[PDB]
Design a protein around this ligand. Structure first.
Ligand SMILES: [Cl-]
Ligand SMILES: [Cl-]
Ligand SMILES: [Fe+3]
Ligand SMILES: [Fe+3]
Ligand SMILES: [Fe+3]
Ligand SMILES: [Fe+3]
Ligand SMILES: [Zn+2]
Ligand SMILES: [Zn+2]
Lengths: 354, 346, 346, 354
C-alpha cells in the first residue's frame, strides 16, 4: 500500500558552533571542548561567505546564516508545499578530527543533535547518520546504535576517504548498513588525509569542487571491484551533490575493462553497467547543465537507466540552476515522476502521509 | 643530415607510437658517470621497487615498425612517445639522472628512427619536475625539425596549471612546440585523489581521473591566458569523459566565478585552441551513436587519432569507429585535427 | 625612519618571538582585491577546514611584549616569527593570496614593532612554494636593516634541498640573509612519513621528524656546496635528536657515498657553518648531564636560544638549563651563537 | 632450565626470482605468474648492485648474488661457530602488491618457501612471518596459520606502513601476535603508499635509508599512544636494521609530552620511558657509530636500559662496522653478554642446544 512521496534527498543542517554539541558529550569530552577554546571543525566544502553557501532568498538566523535551525530550514524547504520529506545531511567535519576517540564522540553528539533538535521538531525531516570514518568498526557501531530510530534513513560518507571504501578495512560500514537496511551515501567533501587529486592540491575551491567527481569514479570502481555488491547484495549507494553527467563515460570504460580483466575480479559476474544501474542512485542538485533543453532526456540515454536520478534541492546551497529547472531538460512526464518520487522510493520507502 | 618540415597530406596522423628500444641503445649517448651509477642503483623512482612500477600489467626494429604499422594502415605522421628503456624517465627521483636519460632518449630516437624514416617524429621527454632542465633540453633539441612536441606525464607533483611548470611552457611555445601529456603512473601521489586502487579495473580506469584533474588546473590556473600561444594534448586518456567534466566546470563557474576574478574567458572557452585529446583507447558506449555526440560536445576540432602501437589495446585505424559514425568527423580526427595540433601547413 | 644594524652586547638572543597581532592590522597593507576575497573564501590551505588547521591545540600590544619578555629577562635581540593573523600565511593554496599576506605581514611587523623598538627584528615570511614570489619579496624588503632572516616552514611539498627552492637561497644570501625554518603543519603530505598521527603526543613529538628529513635533504642535496654562503636554522625542532641523526648519516655515507659522487665534503662536515638550531623546547634527558653531551655532539657553535613567547611551553631564560650545565656553553647559546648566526659584528 | 643462546636477530633470504614461488601458489595464481611474464617485486631497500647489498667475502650463487640459498647463508653465518641461531627475514616486497588477494597469496607462498627451502634445511635457522599488511584481518589469519610451526619466531612488518600500526585498523595484527606469543618486528623498508617523509620523496637511496629512522619514531609513538601496550600487554617489538641512537632523544620528548597530555591518553599510566624499555628491543647492525670507542656504553646510559639491544649481523648487508665491532664501544663484559644472548632470550627463549 502507498504512493511514493516526493523526497528531497539532500538538504543540509549547519551546526551553529562546536558549542552546540556540549549538551550531548560525556563530562570528559565536554570539559575538553570548553577547555580547547572550542576549535570549530566547520568544513571548507561550501565556504561560509562564498556564493554557493546560501541563497539570497533563504531565511537566516541571528548572525545571518541559513540552515542553523530546523525552524528556518522547514520554513523554506516546505514553503510551496511540493516537498513531502527532506533528507538532512549535516556536514560538520567530525570526520577530520584526527583524535580517533574524539571523532567517535563528536560523531555521536552530532547525531544526537540532529535527532533531538531537528528530527524531534518536524515529522517531515529525515537524516543520514554521521559516522566516525577514521575507525570503521566504531562507525559500524554508530550505525547499529541508530538502527533503531527509523527516522535515520541512510549512512553518510565523504566523497574523499582515507582508503577507498572497497578496501576490506571499510567492510564493517557496508555490513552495518546492510544489516540496518540503510543505503550508504557519498556526499561531496573529504577527510583530506591526502591531496584531493592524483596530482596534488587544487589551488582554488572552484577547482576542488568541480574536480571531486574524479574521486567518486575511484570509489565506485573500488566498491564494485573489491566485491561489496556480492558480499552485501542489498547495498544501495546514493551519490549526493556530486553531479551525474560524468557517469556514462565512466561506466562504459569500466564495462570495457571488466570484459578485459574478468578473471581478476571473478566474483563480479554481472556487468558493472548493470550493477551501477541497479545499486547506485544520485541526486539532481547540481544538475550541471542537464537542466538545459533536451540534456536531461539525453543523460538518461547515456546512463541507460531511468531508475538512477533522485530529486534534490541541496538546500541551502546556491547553484546555477534551481531545484525544479531539471524540468527544462525533458519532454517526458514519466521520467519526472521517477525522479521526484519513484526512484527515491527505492532508497527509503517513504509514501505520502496524511 | 637535415630534415623537411613534417608534411601531412592524403594520410593519417597517429599521435601515439611506442618504439621498441633495445638494451645496448642509450649508452653511446650516456656519460660513463651515469652508466656505472645505473649499474649500482638503477633508476630509482616513486616506488619501493627495484625494477617494476606500482601497477605492473632499416634494421634494429625499424622494419617491424614500418611494415605492420606505418605501411599496413597508410600512416603518414606517427608521433614517437618513448617512456624509457628497459618506467618513465623524467620521474626518476635523481633529477640529474632523469635529465641525462631524456637527453639520451632524445638523441637516440632522433639519430635512429625519425631521421631513418621522417614519417615518424618525436615528442621529447623532459624533466617536468626540474624546470631548469626542461627549458635546457627544449633549447638543446626542440629547435630541431625532428622535434614536434614536448612530452610530459599525466601524473605530476603539482597540478599542471601550477606556476612551477610555467618556465617550461614559455620555453615550449617560445620554440613553437605543443606539449603532449601521456598516461602515467607515479607522480608523487596515490593512484586516485582518495587512495591507491587495488584491482586492475580500478587501476586502468583510474587513469582517466588524473587527466580530469589536470584539465581543470590548466584552465582555471589562468595558464592559457598567460600563455595564449600554448597548445596541450591529453594522450591515452579517453576523450569522452571530458565533455561532462567541461560541462560541470562551466555550471559551477557561473556561481563561483568570483573566486578567480582574473580568468578572462569562461572556462570551456579555453578549449578552443588549447586542449586536444588522443582517441586511444576508443570509447565504446552501449548505444554507439553517443560517441560522436560526446566527441563534438568536448570539441570536434581538438581530437587526434592514435593507435598505441604496440600496446595490447591498440585500435585498428578504422575498425575503431562504430556503425554510422559521422564521416566528416572521422576524417577530421584522422587528418585535419592532428595537422592543426602539430603545426603543419595545410 | 632609519635603523641601526642589529647590535648584540651584554645581552641575550631570543630567536623565536611570536607577536600577538590584532584583527584590524593588515588591512592598511592589503589591496581591496584580497580583502573581499578573504571575506568570500578565507585563507584556504591544505585542510578541508574553514578556520582551524589539521591539529588544533607604545600601544597595541608592544607594551606587554616589551615588559614581561624584552625587559623581564634582559633580552636584547628577539627575532620575530609571525605565522599569520587570526595558520601560516605562505601555505595558503592560492599562492597569489599567500604572497600578498606575507607582503602585508612584512610591512606591518616592520612599521609597527621593530621600528618602534629595534630590540626586536624580523624574519620575513615568504612563499617557499612559489619561488618567484620568494625572490620578489626578498628583494622588496630583505634589503631593509629591519630584516634579519627569511622565514620558512618545517613542512614543504618537496624536501628543502630540492632545486625548486634554490632560487630562494641565492636571493636570500645574495642579500646576506640567513633562513630560519619554523615548526609547521600542512606542507602537502601527512604528519609523518608513514601516516597521520592520532593523539597529541604523536602530533607534538612528530614535529621532530620533519626536521630530520629536512636536514638530511639539505646536506645530501649538495645544497651547501652550490651555496657555500648559506646559513639555515631549525626552530622549535628540538636540538638533541639531531646528533644521532647526523651520526647515522655519516655511518651510512661511509658505505654508500658512491651514490652521490659530487658531495664535496663528508655530510657531518656541512654542519660547521650551515646548520643551526633553536633550543626551545629544551630537551630534558632523565640524567641531566646527557644534554650538554648531546648539544656539543650536534655542534656547540650552532645552537641559539629561544623562548617561544607567548606559547605555553616557553622556557625561562635560565630556569631552562639543568643542575651543572656547562657555563661556557650556556653563555655561547645565549649570546655568542645567535650573534654568529644572524650576522652581527662582535 | 637453560643458558640463553647467541641469536643473530636479523639475517636475510633473497628470493632468487618471482618464479621461486610458482610451486607454492594455487593453480589460479600460478598461471597468473607465468602469464604476467612475472613482474618481480624485489625491493629497492638494498639495491641489487649497491655497496650495502652484500659483502665482498660473501658466498655467492650462479648469478653472483648472496643469500639466495640456505646453503650459502648457513655456510657464511655459522662459519666461525659463534652464532647459535639466526632469524631469517625475507624482504621480497609482497607488501607492495596492490592487488589485495595477490598480496595475501604471495605472502603465504613466500612463507612456504622459507619453511620448506630454508627452515627445513637447517635446525639453526628461524624466521619471521611475512604477512599481507594491506589486509590486516588476513595478516592476522596468516599469523594464526603459522602459529603452529614454532620455527617462526616473530611477525615481520615494514618500517613504513600505510596507516600507523597503532590505528585500530591494525589491531588484528597485534592481537594475533599476542595470541601466538610472537614479537612483532619493524624492519626498514616500506609499502610506499605515501612519500616516505613528511616533506616528500627523498632523492637518493642514501637519503631514504638514513631518514627511515623518522618513521620508526612515528610508529612507536602511535603504537604506544593508541594503547597497543595495554590491550595486548604481552607485546614485544623488535626494531630490525633501523639504528638505535635516535631513541633516547625521542623517548625524552615522548615522556615530556606524555606528562603534558596525560588525560588525552588516560590508558597510558606508566611512562613511555618505562614502556619503551620493557617492550621495544632493537638489533645492533647497523651500529651507527656506537661501535666507536665508549659510544656503546654511553648509548645504554641515554637509553637507561641494558635490556634493549639484541645482537645482529644483518647478513649479508655491508655496513661501515662489522657484526662484532660493537665490542669496541664498551668496557663492560656484562653488557656484551646481555646483547649477545640475554636480551634476545626475551624475544624467543632460545637456549644453547647440543
Ligand atoms: Cl578512409
Ligand atoms: Cl647570566
Ligand atoms: Fe600510449
Ligand atoms: Fe598504452
Ligand atoms: Fe615557535
Ligand atoms: Fe610554539
Ligand atoms: Zn549537498
Ligand atoms: Zn636487516
Amino acid at each position: 500500500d502507498g504512493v511514493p512521496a516526493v523526497v528531497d534527498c539532500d538538504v543540509h543542517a549547519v551546526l551553529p558552533s562546536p558549542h552546540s554539541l556540549i549538551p550531548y558529550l560525556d563530562e570528559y569530552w565536554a570539559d575538553q571542548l570548553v577547555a580547547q577554546l572550542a576549535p570549530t571543525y566547520e568544513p571548507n566544502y561550501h565556504p561560509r561567505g562564498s556564493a554557493i553557501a546560501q541563497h539570497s532568498d533563504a531565511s537566516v538566523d541571528e548572525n545571518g546564516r541559513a540552515a542553523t535551525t530546523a525552524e528556518n530550514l522547514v520554513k523554506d524547504v516546505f514553503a510551496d508545499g511540493f516537498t513531502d520529506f527532506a533528507v538532512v545531511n549535516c556536514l560538520y567535519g567530525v570526520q577530520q578530527i584526527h583524535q580517533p576517540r574524539r571523532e567517535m564522540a563528536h560523531a555521536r553528539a552530532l547525531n544526537h543533535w540532529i535527532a533531538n533538535e531537528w528530527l524531534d521538531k518536524d515529522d517531515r525531516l529525515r537524516a543520514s547518520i554521521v559516522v566516525p570514518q577514521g575507525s570503521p568498526r566504531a562507525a559500524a557501531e554508530e550505525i547499529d546504535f541508530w538502527s533503531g530510530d527509523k527516522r535515520f534513513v541512510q549512512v553518510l560518507l565523504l566523497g574523499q576517504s582515507e582508503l577507498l571504501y572497497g578496501r576490506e578495512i571499510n567492510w564493517p560500514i557496508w555490513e552495518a548498513a546492510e544489516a540496518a537496511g540503510l543505503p550508504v551515501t557519498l556526499h561531496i567533501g573529504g577527510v583530506f588525509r591526502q591531496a584531493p587529486t592524483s596530482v596534488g592540491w587544487p589551488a582554488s575551491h572552484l577547482e576542488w569542487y568541480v574536480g571531486q567527481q574524479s574521486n567518486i569514479e575511484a570509489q565506485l570502481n573500488s566498491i564494485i571491484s573489491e566485491g561489496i555488491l556480492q558480499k552485501f547484495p542489498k547495498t544501495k549507494i546514493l551519490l549526493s551533490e556530486l553531479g551525474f553527467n560524468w557517469l556514462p563515460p565512466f561506466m562504459w570504460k569500466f564495462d570495457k575493462l571488466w570484459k578485459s580483466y574478468r578473471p581478476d575480479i571473478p566474483w563480479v559476474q554481472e556487468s558493472p553497467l548493470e550493477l551501477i544501474r541497479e545499486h547506485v542512485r544520485v541526486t539532481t542538485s547540481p544538475s550541471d547543465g542537464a537542466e538545459e533543453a533536451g540534456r536531461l532526456d539525453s543523460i538518461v540515454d547515456r546512463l541507460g537507466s531511468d531508475r538512477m536520478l533522485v530529486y534534490s534541492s541541496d538546500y541551502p546551497h546556491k547553484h546555477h540552476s534551481g531545484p525544479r529547472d531539471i524540468e527544462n531538460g525533458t519532454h517526458s512526464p514519466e521520467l519526472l515522476d521517477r525522479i521526484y518520487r519513484r526512484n527515491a522510493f527505492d532508497l527509503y520507502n517513504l509514501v505520502v502521509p496524511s | 643530415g637535415t630534415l623537411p618540415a613534417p608534411s601531412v597530406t592524403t594520410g593519417i596522423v597517429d599521435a601515439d607510437i611506442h618504439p621498441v628500444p633495445q638494451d645496448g641503445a642509450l649508452e653511446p649517448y650516456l656519460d660513463d658517470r651515469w652508466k656505472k651509477h645505473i649499474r649500482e642503483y638503477g633508476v630509482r623512482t616513486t616506488t619501493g621497487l627495484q625494477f617494476i612500477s606500482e601497477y605492473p600489467q632499416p634494421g634494429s626494429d625499424r622494419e617491424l615498425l614500418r611494415t605492420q604499422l606505418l605501411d599496413k594502415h597508410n600512416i603518414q605522421l606517427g608521433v614517437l612517445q618513448c617512456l624509457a628503456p628497459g618506467n618513465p624517465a623524467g620521474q626518476a627521483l635523481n633529477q640529474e639522472l632523469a635529465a641525462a636519460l631524456c637527453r639520451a632518449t632524445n638523441d637516440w630516437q632522433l639519430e635512429h628512427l625519425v631521421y631513418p624514416d621522417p614519417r615518424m617524429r618525436a615528442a621529447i621527454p623532459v624533466t617536468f619536475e626540474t624546470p631548469d632542465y626542461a627549458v635546457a633540453e627544449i633549447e638543446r633539441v626542440g629547435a630541431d625539425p625532428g622535434v614536434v612536441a614536448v612530452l610530459g606525464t599525466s601524473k605530476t607533483l603539482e597540478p599542471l596549471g601550477s606556476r612551477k611548470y610555467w618556465p617550461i611552457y614559455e620555453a615550449s611555445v617560445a620554440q613553437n612546440l605543443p606539449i603532449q601529456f601521456h598516461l602515467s603512473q607515479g607522480g608523487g601521489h596515490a593512484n586516485t585523489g582518495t587512495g591507491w586502487t587495488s584491482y586492475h579495473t580500478e587501476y586502468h580506469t583510474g587513469h582517466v581521473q588524473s587527466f580530469q584533474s589536470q584539465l581543470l588546473s590548466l584552465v582555471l590556473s589562468g595558464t592559457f591566458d598567460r600563455f595564449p600561444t600554448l597548445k596541450v594534448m591529453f594522450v591515452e586518456g579517453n576523450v569522452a569523459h571530458f565533455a561532462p567534466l567541461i560541462q560541470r566546470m562551466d555550471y559551477t563557474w557561473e556561481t563561483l566565478r568570483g573566486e578567480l576574478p582574473d580568468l578572462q574567458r569562461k572556462p570551456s572557452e579555453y578549449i578552443r585552441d588549447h586542449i586536444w585529446a588522443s582517441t586511444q583507447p576508443i570509447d565504446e558506449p552501449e548505444k554507439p551513436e553517443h560517441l560522436a555526440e560526446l566527441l563534438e560536445e568536448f570539441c570536434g576540432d581538438n581530437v587526434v587519432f592514435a593507435t598505441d602501437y604496440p600496446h595490447f589495446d591498440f585500435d585498428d585505424p578504422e575498425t575503431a569507429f562504430p556503425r554510422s559514425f559521422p564521416v566528416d568527423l572521422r576524417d577530421k580526427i584522422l587528418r585535419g585535427n592532428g595537422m592543426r595540433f602539430f603545426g603543419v601547413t595545410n
